[PDB]
Nucleic acid binder design. Structure first.
Ligand SMILES: [Mg+2]
Ligand SMILES: [Mg+2]
Ligand SMILES: [Mg+2]
Ligand SMILES: [Mg+2]
Ligand SMILES: [Mg+2]
Ligand SMILES: [Mg+2]
Ligand SMILES: [Mg+2]
Ligand SMILES: [Mg+2]
Ligand SMILES: [Mg+2]
Ligand SMILES: [Mg+2]
Ligand SMILES: [Mg+2]
Ligand SMILES: [Mg+2]
Ligand SMILES: [Mg+2]
Ligand SMILES: [Mg+2]
Ligand SMILES: [Mg+2]
Ligand SMILES: [Mg+2]
Ligand SMILES: [Mg+2]
Ligand SMILES: [Mg+2]
Ligand SMILES: [Mg+2]
Ligand SMILES: [Mg+2]
Ligand SMILES: [Mg+2]
Ligand SMILES: [Mg+2]
Ligand SMILES: [Mg+2]
Ligand SMILES: [Mg+2]
Ligand SMILES: [Mg+2]
Ligand SMILES: [Mg+2]
Ligand SMILES: [Mg+2]
Ligand SMILES: [Mg+2]
Ligand SMILES: [Mg+2]
Ligand SMILES: [Mg+2]
Ligand SMILES: [Mg+2]
Ligand SMILES: [Mg+2]
Ligand SMILES: [Mg+2]
Ligand SMILES: [Mg+2]
Ligand SMILES: [Mg+2]
Ligand SMILES: [Mg+2]
Ligand SMILES: [Mg+2]
Ligand SMILES: [Mg+2]
Ligand SMILES: [Mg+2]
Ligand SMILES: [Mg+2]
Ligand SMILES: [Mg+2]
Ligand SMILES: [Mg+2]
Ligand SMILES: [Mg+2]
Ligand SMILES: [Mg+2]
Ligand SMILES: [Mg+2]
Ligand SMILES: [Mg+2]
Ligand SMILES: [Mg+2]
Lengths: 120, 122, 114, 209, 56
RNA sequence: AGGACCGAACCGACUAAUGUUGAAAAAUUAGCGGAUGACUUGUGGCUGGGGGUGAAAGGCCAAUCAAACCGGGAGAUAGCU
RNA sequence: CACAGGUGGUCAGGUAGAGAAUACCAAGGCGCUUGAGAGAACUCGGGUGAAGGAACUAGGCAAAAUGGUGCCGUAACUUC
RNA sequence: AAUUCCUUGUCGGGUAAGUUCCGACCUGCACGAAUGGCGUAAUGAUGGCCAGGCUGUCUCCACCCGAGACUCAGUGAAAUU
RNA sequence: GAUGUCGGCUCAUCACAUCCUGGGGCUGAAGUAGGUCCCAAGGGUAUGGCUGUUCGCCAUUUAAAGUGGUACGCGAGCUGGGUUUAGAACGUCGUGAGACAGUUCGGUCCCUAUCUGCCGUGGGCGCUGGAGAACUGAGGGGGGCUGCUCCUAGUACGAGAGGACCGGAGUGGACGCAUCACUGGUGUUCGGGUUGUCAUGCCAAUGGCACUGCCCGGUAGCUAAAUGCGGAAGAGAUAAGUGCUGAAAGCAUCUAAGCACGAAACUUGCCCCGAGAUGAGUUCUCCCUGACCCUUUAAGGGUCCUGAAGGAACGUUGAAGACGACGACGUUGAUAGGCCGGGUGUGUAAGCGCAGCGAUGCGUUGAGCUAACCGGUACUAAUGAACCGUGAGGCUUAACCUU
């Protein structure tokens, strides 16, 4: 039974899941639009959205917290300088998932995940 | 929570130091003895020139357990170790005269009255 | 849950003093011998606190006749009349179950003067 | 006597002055509305139908709404029936409240138990496991034998096997009613009752007592 | 473990009676580009619910 | 000094689990034994079938051993199926 | 078999370490040619566990446990 | 007794309880002196027994992490009959 | 041209020649406890030591530790200790090879389930217009065990010793159901400590890897060892048995007529499934009230228009779940996530400052972080639609409309 449990295992261990999401978090922040699988995209929301939220209160402790969960200083910078200010007024929902069909190789259901205000 | 093969310390001056529970008395297939429950014991360790001696089979009542008692408010009292007070086989009154260590009010019954009195606590 | 919250806080106590794991505490507890009830004291060290509203609990471990005695108290029970910090203790851990292993000078709590 | 429908809010305790902690399930018993009185003539048995709670006008179907509208009651979340014992009368539109349990001492509660899905024999039927070691080849929690040899030559019916466990109607009987709170629409029942927090409960007085 | 008798052509088809695929019950049409697409999915030209949220 | 001690490479294979249409016609995993010797290993060489070789288990002699393999006698014979 | 096997020699970086052990790394090289989801039973490989502690079992099988350096200390017996 | 049928021999130890174990007894069914007899320190992946410690071995299972099992897509067996 | 053989484990099922519990007659039955037979198979019916054991002895339990059948039930479920391969040895027989219903030590247990069967779970069609709900309950299943203490009463009984039925009250054991409020376990998704090493340029702070590196704690959920509940009472008809009246048979006779007592068995009562109950049932509510062509004119086929109730699909999802299914929600919205606030857990972050040669300590400060929790909030994502499903529902008879 899985009753009231959150957290997709995604046919990985904990270390691999944390690491992929850290990678997927930075790719999103960097590209502002990434194609992944739909279930990965739904979890990605639970990793990426709290960092944008942390990125509104620019304290050095916050840069350190983001660096611990991002391990990239391009991503911390873009969070606290561009994303944090850009989502200053938004009470959550920084990302939007848009389903985009099935992958040719394995028929995985895909989804584009995006920042709600891309402006490119 | 006292079952067969569990070692118990002794809470009396009978002469035994260590005893082993060999039978939880009461019902059939009765798995455990708690505080206030009579058990059958063998003495695995005794002091020389004592009332009891090693290998003697007799009865004991549990007075303290590591699992502990439960109270009606939901409070639990747990002891550091499991201890017993030896009892005669056909009389079930205590062999000793002193009771060493605390006891509980789960022994406040006509049968165990001569233990709560001689105890230093409850 | 607001239902349960309201039903819970309606019987919670108001007098519960602040204490901390490591503090030495004299819990006064009712014992009913027949009909006439008298308070009994259990002085010892707080090794664990559970903070869950009405379901809050705290464990006091004391040594008695060489026999380590732990008592888990339900802090909002009417069985418990009074909690009283007699000594504050400086520990760095929420839970002090390691004090079970220790004895005498090994299980001493340095005093808090914060 | 009839019973009432409610909802599982959760469990709490009631401390008494004497020192006793009483575990209770809190049952939210909103006012039960009679939607249909079945009588011996037209229906063939004497019962009442009730609804309670609320449903969206947008999620009520037209068949449901006419049935509520005929009774002159607001659409609740479901329909439940209670049989009548030959003296108790009721009228459509009549609102029955938790005060009906004011004088009762013990109640039977029924709900849908928590669902455990596909359960093994160990969990579902208290089947003892086999040896964890001492040679055991792939048969640690497996059910063992399921029968005899070329005489029945088949598995008998009702053989305790692995499958769906829970998510079924369960009645727990003779539960002490701790407190009836009419102004707050709550029944307090000593002890656990079936199902998950937030689940429909039916509460009746105890048959046995 | 294994069959004592060859199952027939008929038993084989009865097993496959549930093997038919369901078709798409309906395609949805974009309010702006008129493309057909899977409902709640984006179009092949990059439109979702009339908005062009892809580059291509 | 040592057919000495602990322990890797290296050589082996006591237990257990896995696997038993295997990843594998004998392995894998965890542990286990020897580990300067009667050790181990490479290259090449010699011993040939009632023969070899064997610290001896009828063990091994190209996944084959109480008489190898291939070919021949040969369509042995088969009061049996 | 693009097979968890077998296959001799040579080269031998850094931190820790007695070490060619072990962990992490460098150089260099790989991610093992189906993937995507789900988070049932059961199986496998593992982690933890109240109280009890071999009551298991043919058998403590397996697990758990012990494990290092130095100082002290070390029985029976003995071919010393 | 790696030898004893009778046999779980008798007694004793150890255990609450011991067909095993140890010790002694002799009634050696059916030991016995280099197909060696009796001992024997050390050694043993040797056989049997005991204890300390340890533990999911067990009482009596519970939860968790992973690989499968289940679902989708692709490839696509087998024994049997 | 193979039906795997002892015992164990797991799971069991029937029989009754009944071990306990229940009901009873005789007793050389005072009472307590027994003896023996009759009825009764509802439920229940040990853990250990020794041995491969079945068994048996012994220890200690229990209300009792029943007897048998099921391939001496169960190896395509487990084990492999015994026993029947190859090794080796003792004794013994034999010149010997070898051998023993003698012993010893050691020694590969395969199978992805087609059918039946079983446990679960769905799809299809049917149930005669379609649809959404609520039900009746034919039938089926589950459950059915009992100890101890106290009162009645130290009474009835008995010379004493001891010591009741009947009825009653409480508390346990075992089994089962539910559940998480408590007590706990778990918690590789929370926090913290810490060893070694690498990296983030370095300091400081962090992260990776080392079984989650090792540990200490611990949310939710799941859960037992935790805590609530249950077995019933009662009714009906009976068993063995006890009787009333009562002839046949002037009497007697429980029986022939007739009448009544009488048990955990039976039927009910309690719980669960349940109209595929094709004998397909009932009740409530909802929807559909148009044109016509055709011809073997028949429950006929086709065209146009219409497309409902509702359903499904899709999507967000769930204390529901293998998949289906079930439930909740879909902007007229709290369905999920995010966010806010709280709680919870961890236990006083970082940075700065003070003290100290320094390790570190103190202060800012119960700080910082905080998963699944609570209460809220449309920020994100749950599309305007399309799709399926129709268009008043056979014949015959009867009654009511309307005797
Ligand atoms: Mg996969
Ligand atoms: Mg790791
Ligand atoms: Mg469930
Ligand atoms: Mg296994
Ligand atoms: Mg048959
Ligand atoms: Mg050597
Ligand atoms: Mg050596
Ligand atoms: Mg090599
Ligand atoms: Mg290998
Ligand atoms: Mg190995
Ligand atoms: Mg060595
Ligand atoms: Mg031979
Ligand atoms: Mg060969
Ligand atoms: Mg020739
Ligand atoms: Mg021929
Ligand atoms: Mg010839
Ligand atoms: Mg490959
Ligand atoms: Mg290495
Ligand atoms: Mg799993
Ligand atoms: Mg444990
Ligand atoms: Mg422990
Ligand atoms: Mg044993
Ligand atoms: Mg046993
Ligand atoms: Mg044995
Ligand atoms: Mg071992
Ligand atoms: Mg280990
Ligand atoms: Mg023993
Ligand atoms: Mg033994
Ligand atoms: Mg000889
Ligand atoms: Mg030896
Ligand atoms: Mg496939
Ligand atoms: Mg074929
Ligand atoms: Mg009979
Ligand atoms: Mg009955
Ligand atoms: Mg026995
Ligand atoms: Mg039987
Ligand atoms: Mg058999
Ligand atoms: Mg079989
Ligand atoms: Mg054997
Ligand atoms: Mg097998
Ligand atoms: Mg068949
Ligand atoms: Mg928990
Ligand atoms: Mg540093
Ligand atoms: Mg690295
Ligand atoms: Mg980690
Ligand atoms: Mg600070
Ligand atoms: Mg909320």
């Amino acid at each position: 039974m899985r009753h009231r449990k959150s957290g997709r295992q995604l046919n990985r261990n904990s270390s691999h899941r944390q690491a992929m999401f850290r990678n997927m978090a930075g790719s999103l922040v960097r590209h502002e639009i990434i194609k992944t699988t739909l279930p990965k995209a739904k979890e990605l929301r639970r990793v990426v959205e709290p960092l944008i939220t942390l990125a509104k209160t620019d304290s050095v402790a916050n840069r350190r917290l983001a660096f611990a969960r991002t391990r990239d200083n391009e991503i911390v910078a873009k969070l606290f300088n561009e994303l944090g200010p850009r989502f200053a007024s938004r009470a959550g929902g920084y990302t939007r998932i848009l389903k985009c069909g099935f992958r040719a190789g394995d028929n995985a259901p895909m989804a584009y995940i995006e920042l709600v205000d891309r402006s490119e | 929570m006292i079952q067969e093969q569990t070692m118990l310390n002794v809470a009396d001056n009978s002469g035994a130091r260590r005893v082993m529970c060999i039978k939880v008395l009461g019902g059939s297939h009765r798995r455990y003895a708690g505080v206030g429950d009579i058990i059958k014991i063998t003495i695995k360790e005794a002091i020389p020139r004592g009332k009891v001696k090693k290998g003697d089979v007799l009865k004991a009542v549990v007075v303290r357990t590591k699992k502990g008692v439960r109270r009606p408010d939901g409070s639990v009292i747990r002891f550091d170790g499991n201890a017993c007070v030896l009892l005669n086989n056909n009389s079930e009154q205590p062999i000793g005269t002193r009771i060493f260590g605390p006891v509980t009010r789960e022994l406040r019954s006509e049968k165990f009255m001569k233990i709560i009195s001689l105890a230093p606590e409850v | 849950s607001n239902i349960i919250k309201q039903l819970e806080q309606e019987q919670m106590k108001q007098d519960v003093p602040s204490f901390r794991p490591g503090d030495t505490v004299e819990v006064k507890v009712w014992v009913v011998e027949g009909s006439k009830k008298r308070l009994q004291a259990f002085e010892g060290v707080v090794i664990a606190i559970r903070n869950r509203g009405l379901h809050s609990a705290f464990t006091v471990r004391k040594i008695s006749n060489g026999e380590g005695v732990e008592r888990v108290f339900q802090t909002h029970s009417p069985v418990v009349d009074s909690i009283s910090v007699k000594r504050r203790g400086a520990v760095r851990k929420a839970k002090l179950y390691y004090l079970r292993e220790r004895t005498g000078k090994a299980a001493r709590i340095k005093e808090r003067l914060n | 006597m009839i019973g009432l429908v409610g909802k599982k809010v959760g469990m709490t305790r009631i401390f008494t002055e004497d020192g006793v902690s009483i575990p209770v399930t809190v049952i939210e018993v909103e006012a039960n509305r009679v939607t249909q009185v079945k009588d011996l003539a037209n229906d063939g048995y004497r019962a009442i139908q009730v609804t309670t709670g609320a449903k969206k006008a947008n999620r009520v179907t037209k068949p449901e709404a006419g049935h509520f509208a005929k009774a002159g009651v607001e659409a609740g979340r479901g329909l439940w029936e209670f049989r009548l014992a030959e003296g108790e009368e009721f009228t459509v539109g009549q609102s029955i409240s938790v005060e009906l349990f004011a004088d009762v001492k013990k109640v039977d509660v029924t709900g849908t138990s928590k669902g455990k899905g596909f359960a093994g024999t160990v969990k579902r039927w208290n089947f003892r496991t086999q040896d964890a070691t001492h040679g055991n080849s792939l048969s640690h929690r497996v059910p063992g034998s399921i029968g005899q040899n070329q005489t029945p030559g088949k598995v008998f019916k009702g053989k305790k096997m692995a499958g769906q466990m829970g998510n079924e109607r369960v009645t727990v009987q003779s539960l002490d009613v701790v407190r009836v709170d009419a102004e707050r629409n709550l029944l307090l029942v000593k002890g656990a009752v079936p199902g998950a927090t937030g689940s429909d409960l039916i509460v009746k007085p105890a048959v046995k007592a | 473990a294994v069959q004592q008798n060859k199952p027939t052509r008929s038993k084989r088809g009865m097993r496959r009676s549930h093997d038919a695929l369901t078709a798409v019950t309906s395609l949805s049409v974009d309010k702006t580009s008129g493309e057909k697409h899977l409902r709640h999915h984006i179009t092949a030209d990059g439109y979702y619910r009339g908005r062009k949220v892809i580059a291509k």
